[PDB]
Amino acid sequence: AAQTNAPWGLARISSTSPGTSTYYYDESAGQGSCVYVIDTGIEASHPEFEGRAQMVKTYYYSSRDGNGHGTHCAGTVGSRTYGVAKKTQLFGVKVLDDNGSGQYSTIIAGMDFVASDKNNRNCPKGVVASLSLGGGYSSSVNSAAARLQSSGVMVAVAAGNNNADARNYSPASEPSVCTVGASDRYDRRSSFSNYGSVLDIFGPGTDILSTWIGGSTRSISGTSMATPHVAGLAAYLMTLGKTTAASACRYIADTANKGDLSNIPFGTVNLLAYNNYQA
Ligand SMILES: [Ca+2]
Numbered sequence: 001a002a003q004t005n006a007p008w009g010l011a012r013i014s015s016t017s018p019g020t021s022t023y024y025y026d027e028s029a030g031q032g033s034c035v036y037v038i039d040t041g042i043e044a045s046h047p048e049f050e051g052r053a054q055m056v057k058t059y060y061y062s063s064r065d066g067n068g069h070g071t072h073c074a075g076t077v078g079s080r081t082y083g084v085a086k087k088t089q090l091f092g093v094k095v096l097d098d099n100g101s102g103q104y105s106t107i108i109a110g111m112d113f114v115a116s117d118k119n120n121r122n123c124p125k126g127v128v129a130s131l132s133l134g135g136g137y138s139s140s141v142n143s144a145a146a147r148l149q150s151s152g153v154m155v156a157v158a159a160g161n162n163n164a165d166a167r168n169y170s171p172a173s174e175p176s177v178c179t180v181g182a183s184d185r186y187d188r189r190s191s192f193s194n195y196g197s198v199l200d201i202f203g204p205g206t207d208i209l210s211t212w213i214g215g216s217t218r219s220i221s222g223t224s225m226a227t228p229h230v231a232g233l234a235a236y237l238m239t240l241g242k243t244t245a246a247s248a249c250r251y252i253a254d255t256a257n258k259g260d261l262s263n264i265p266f267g268t269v270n271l272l273a274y275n276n277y278q279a
């Protein structure tokens with residue numbers, strides 16, 4: 001399949017070079033996979049989700065996404081126009097309030113919820129979790145992310161937007177999950193993107209157009225935007241049977257565009273998520 005005039009991030013993950021406009025992907029498009037978006041919620045009614053999104057858990061008064069961040073991330077995972085895995089099933093877990101903030105105890109609970117809730121869903125091609133959140137280092141947050149990964153979920157987490165070593169941030173610093181840095185349309189590390197040995201992969205993160213609340217769209221930047229690119233790619237590859245939840249991050253790194261990025265500090269992987277699609 002080919003989506004013309006796609007968001008640059010989608011085109012980038014289906015190209016060996018930057019500057020393309022078409023997103024080439026296999027028509028399976030993550031069908032049969034499931035991606036839990038652990039964030040501010042998802043505006044499931046957005047036409048861009050085509051009924052494939054639903055809220056499954058909220059830790060606040062409402063399951064409504066009153067912020068937009070979670071809806072944006074979910075859109076990059078699997079919205080029709082802005083998603084990597086355009087046929088995946090999206091499950092919203094609202095651990096962040098409508099200001100985009102959340103207590104670590106609630107974020108931990110949301111991870112534990114997904115690890116259990118997945119056993120009640122039909123996700124034959126596997127389960128992915130996109131965690132476009134994080135704060136300071138927390139062994140308990142890291143352990144929760146490790147538990148979620150160990151339970152059989154492909155966990156993708158944002159590296160953080162501190163332009164610093166992700167070792168000091170969680171769940172970014174959890175080794176067992178897929179820690180995602182951000183790049184821009186010119187194959188530079190996003191000026192805000194965290195770095196360091198714990199990063200597994202980079203994804204498009206600067207000026208990422210996706211869904212937004214109120215049935216709208218907007219372009220925002222962050223490692224929160226690169227993470228769903230990798231989560232959606234994992235779902236896409238798992239549907240293709242090329243990898244599993246336990247190995248998806250290693251597979252994405254193994255098959256990534258290598259050495260394409262600039263402004264990558266020594267010791268940080270120079271790997272950009274790439275779907276290796278061949279028509
Ligand atoms: Ca290249």
Ligand SMILES: [Ca+2]
Nearest residue numbers: 175176177200
């Ligand atoms: Ca890792």
